[PDB]
Enzyme design. Sequence first.
Site, short mmCIF file in Angstrom:
data_model
loop_
_atom_site.label_atom_id
_atom_site.label_comp_id
_atom_site.label_asym_id
_atom_site.label_seq_id
_atom_site.Cartn_x
_atom_site.Cartn_y
_atom_site.Cartn_z
N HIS A 78 0.62 -1.37 0.09
CA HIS A 78 0.06 0.00 -0.06
C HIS A 78 0.82 1.22 -0.03
CE1 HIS A 78 -3.42 -2.65 1.76
NE2 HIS A 78 -3.11 -2.82 0.84
N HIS A 237 -9.04 -1.85 -5.06
CA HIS A 237 -8.07 -2.12 -4.20
C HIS A 237 -7.08 -3.07 -4.79
CE1 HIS A 237 -5.95 -2.26 -0.20
NE2 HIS A 237 -5.73 -3.37 -0.68
N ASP A 241 -3.23 -2.59 -5.25
CA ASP A 241 -2.41 -3.59 -4.83
C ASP A 241 -1.44 -3.93 -5.80
OD1 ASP A 241 -2.95 -3.93 -2.13
OD2 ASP A 241 -4.23 -5.95 -2.46
N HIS A 264 -0.70 -11.10 -4.82
CA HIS A 264 0.70 -10.72 -4.43
C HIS A 264 1.71 -11.72 -5.05
CE1 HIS A 264 -0.90 -7.55 -2.25
NE2 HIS A 264 -1.45 -8.54 -1.33
#
EC number: 3.5.1.108
Length: 296
Positions: A78, A237, A241, A264
């Site tokens: 973030h 979001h 990310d 991720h």
Amino acid sequence: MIKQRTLKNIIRATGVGLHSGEKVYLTLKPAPVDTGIVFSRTDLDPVVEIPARAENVGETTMSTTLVKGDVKVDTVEHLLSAMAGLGIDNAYVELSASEVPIMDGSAGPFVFLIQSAGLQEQEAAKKFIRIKREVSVEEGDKRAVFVPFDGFKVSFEIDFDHPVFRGRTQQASVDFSSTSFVKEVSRARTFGFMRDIEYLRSQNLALGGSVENAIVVDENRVLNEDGLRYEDEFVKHKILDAIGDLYLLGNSLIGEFRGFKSGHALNNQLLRTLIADKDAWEVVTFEDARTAPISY
Ligand SMILES: C[C@@](O)(C(F)F)[C@H](NC(=O)c1ccc(C#CC#Cc2ccc(N)cc2)cc1)C(=O)NO
Ligand SMILES: [Zn+2]
Ligand SMILES: [Zn+2]
């Protein structure tokens, strides 16, 4: 020329780690040309520095973690998203603990810190990584892709079948020619499914989590009383990310990212896969900003 950028001043904040629940001190500092973003664990003796680069990423199951031997910096994505969105090339990030504070769960607080510190132009050309060939990675039905694009664009699709997500857009394509990262992406909060959060908390994990720093949904509804900040906050979001994870390339991108139910792990796999193939990318600069497909 488009110049490299750092902070004008040192700036500070405090918060708690989402995972650890422990209070952490955060410091952002200016850094010389070609430093990139470097994290420092100032609580350790000696102090340990970890460059924010794709090759230093460890476990990615929950958040993106930077690792140097036994020392980790957890949940960097973030903060890095804000660095990327504001075009900060060089900065030191000091931490008193092994995790970046979750703050409000978005990149908003970090945008606020960076902007408050002030932006300093430096006397060196800003380097961009331009995608020349499409590169993709997969795991099951999850997919992360780099696509050539004359500019910077991030596209994402999620595909949740839970009732709470029924009818929601679950897709966004952001061309930053006409989209503000700050106003339209940065304040998108992280989210969690109640069942998953309960499982984490049952193991004494996610100790820093609360409705004040995360969107909580069960099967059927959003539990936060005030609802959403953006109509499509969930997918935004995921885009947030991606932008943060992608900045571990060490430079801003000229190209498009396309994510499909990815996270991720695939983001980092994509980076390492791209970097390894030199026919798929090149470093470019712009002696004349007016000729650039992007603008900061
Ligand atoms: C979104 C995400 O998965 C992505 F990787 F896709 C990922 N998010 C997380 O992994 C995540 C983990 C835990 C929480 C949480 C919570 C809580 C609470 C709580 C406590 C008390 C009460 N009364 C009510 C709520 C939220 C997000 C992410 O954003 N990474 O960057
Ligand atoms: Zn369900
Ligand atoms: Zn996130």
